[PDB]
Write a protein that holds these residues in place. Structure first.
Motif, PDB file in Angstrom:
ATOM      1  N   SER A 209       0.788  -1.232   0.000  1.00 28.84           N
ATOM      2  CA  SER A 209       0.000   0.000   0.000  1.00 28.84           C
ATOM      3  C   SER A 209       0.822   1.284   0.000  1.00 28.84           C
ATOM      4  CB  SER A 209      -0.946   0.016   1.205  1.00 28.84           C
ATOM      5  OG  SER A 209      -0.214   0.113   2.418  1.00 28.84           O
ATOM      6  N   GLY A 277     -10.497  -4.437   0.122  1.00 29.73           N
ATOM      7  CA  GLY A 277     -10.688  -5.122   1.386  1.00 29.73           C
ATOM      8  C   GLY A 277      -9.573  -6.090   1.746  1.00 29.73           C
ATOM      9  N   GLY A 278      -9.920  -7.096   2.547  1.00 22.10           N
ATOM     10  CA  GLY A 278      -8.965  -8.093   2.983  1.00 22.10           C
ATOM     11  C   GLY A 278      -9.661  -9.158   3.816  1.00 22.10           C
ATOM     12  N   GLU A 281      -7.809  -7.574   7.522  1.00 23.71           N
ATOM     13  CA  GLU A 281      -7.370  -6.186   7.464  1.00 23.71           C
ATOM     14  C   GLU A 281      -7.332  -5.797   5.992  1.00 23.71           C
ATOM     15  OE1 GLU A 281      -3.168  -8.133   8.462  1.00 23.71           O
ATOM     16  OE2 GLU A 281      -3.115  -5.940   8.701  1.00 23.71           O
ATOM     17  N   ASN A 282      -7.553  -4.520   5.704  1.00 21.37           N
ATOM     18  CA  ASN A 282      -7.565  -4.062   4.326  1.00 21.37           C
ATOM     19  C   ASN A 282      -6.211  -4.219   3.631  1.00 21.37           C
ATOM     20  OD1 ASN A 282      -9.907  -2.465   5.773  1.00 21.37           O
ATOM     21  ND2 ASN A 282     -10.393  -2.366   3.584  1.00 21.37           N
ATOM     22  N   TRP A 285      -4.691 -10.495   2.228  1.00 21.82           N
ATOM     23  CA  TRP A 285      -5.574 -11.658   2.072  1.00 21.82           C
ATOM     24  C   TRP A 285      -4.881 -12.985   2.401  1.00 21.82           C
ATOM     25  CZ3 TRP A 285     -10.738 -10.869   0.661  1.00 21.82           C
ATOM     26  CH2 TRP A 285     -11.052  -9.621   0.077  1.00 21.82           C
TER      27      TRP A 285
END
Length: 392
Positions: A209, A277-278, A281-282, A285
């Motif tokens: 990110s 999303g995740g 947590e975002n 995955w």
């Protein structure tokens, strides 16, 4: 010697994730790192979650046993050691969240000796085969040098303990090390290696990110045709470590059991906005949640990297497939490395599609793993059930 199969068991996983120690396939590992213990400014190491670590009662734990006793995940770790004599456990101190707590106690002899003493005490009481230190990451020269002094202190504590128990086993000292040049180039690798049994190379989180472009987060080799898709590579780090004087057989290659996502992207190596999303947590995955519906899977065998892409959502996810796990296994074998390490035990698949199982088999099966008996004898433990070998 043989290959090492190392895995991190996260203490907070017993909650939302519903992942308990008894769910671990003990036979496929040689080392389990119990994460993470915290550090007090004095140097004193302590368990982070008393409930998860020592208080929680699992089926089979009695309420009226005589003396002082330990339960929680600690007891479960010892139980696995009883069933698999080739299974070693290590107490992992620090981690990303607790890392800022190293600098102060590491800066002085008092704090270091305190760190060494308390960690050893926990190791001898809780039944561990050794300790693992995860400092992310020493920021400068001073810290870099104090790290070596810290490792020297721990090594001496562990040795002095063995000396008092001649016919007992030797204890381990390990650390999680960076794969990013800017982080490892400030470490006194050769000096540190003198105190370590092995290094757990964190060959992951190469992209995420924090980037402007989507990339492969755990690739072995760089991409020649598309440079921007690979800001890093594990191979670059392995070579530099070896050149720094660290023996290849002491370097364990870390591998992720999760994937990192990128939203609104054309594909690998192009700009992205957001991570979506995740699983919990975002942007992150679990491997067991892959592949998602609507995604096409691409596998780059040559650089050992794979990803999924949903053309409609323009959503990319960088994670390893069994095929790519196989390539990393080949890399380990080819370069005579110490084995494989994974973060973390909760997110892998069970059976044919297990990433760990794939690597282990790619390594030649259980028979090619390092054979070195664990320690079951802890006569100095403050816990009666533990020193009596968890008989019940």
């Amino acid at each position: 010697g043989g290959f090492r199969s190392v895995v991190y068991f996260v203490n907070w996983a017993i909650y939302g994730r519903g992942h308990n120690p008894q769910d671990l396939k003990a036979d496929q590992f040689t080392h389990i790192l119990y994460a993470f213990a915290n550090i007090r400014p004095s140097g004193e190491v302590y368990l982070s979650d008393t409930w998860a670590d020592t208080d929680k009662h699992y089926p089979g734990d009695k309420w009226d046993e005589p003396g002082n006793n330990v339960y929680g995940c600690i007891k479960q770790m010892y139980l696995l050691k009883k069933n698999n004599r080739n299974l070693k456990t290590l107490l992992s101190i620090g981690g990303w969240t607790y890392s800022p707590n190293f600098k102060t106690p590491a800066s002085t002899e008092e704090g270091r000796k305190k760190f060494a003493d308390t960690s050893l005490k926990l190791m001898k009481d809780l039944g561990f085969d050794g300790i693992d230190i995860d400092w992310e990451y020493p920021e400068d020269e001073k810290q870099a040098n104090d790290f070596v002094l810290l490792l020297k202190a721990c090594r001496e504590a562990l040795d002095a303990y063995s000396a008092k128990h001649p016919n007992g086993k030797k204890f381990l000292l390990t650390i999680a090390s960076p794969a990013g040049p800017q982080n490892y180039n400030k470490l006194k690798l050769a000096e540190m290696d003198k105190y370590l049994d092995f290094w757990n190379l964190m060959a992951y989180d190469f992209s995420g990110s924090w980037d402007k472009v989507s990339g492969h987060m755990s690739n072995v080799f760089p991409s020649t045709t598309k440079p921007e898709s690979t800001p890093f590579s594990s191979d670059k780090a392995v070579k530099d470590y070896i050149k720094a004087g660290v023996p290849a057989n002491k370097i364990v290659l870390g591998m992720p059991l999760y994937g990192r996502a990128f939203a609104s992207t054309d594909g690998i190596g192009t700009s992205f906005n957001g991570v979506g999303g995740g699983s919990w947590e975002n942007g992150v995955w679990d491997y067991k949640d892959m592949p998602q519906q609507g995604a096409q899977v691409t596998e780059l065998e040559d650089i050992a990297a794979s990803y999924s892409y949903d053309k409609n959502k323009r959503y990319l996810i960088s994670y390893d497939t069994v095929k790519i796990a196989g390539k990393k296994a080949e890399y380990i074998t080819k370069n005579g490395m110490g084995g494989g390490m994974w973060w973390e035990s909760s997110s892998d698949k069970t059976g044919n599609e297990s990433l760990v199982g794939t690597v282990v088999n790619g390594l030649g099966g259980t028979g090619k793993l390092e054979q070195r008996e664990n320690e079951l004898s802890y006569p100095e433990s403050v816990y009666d059930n533990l020193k009596n070998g968890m008989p019940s």
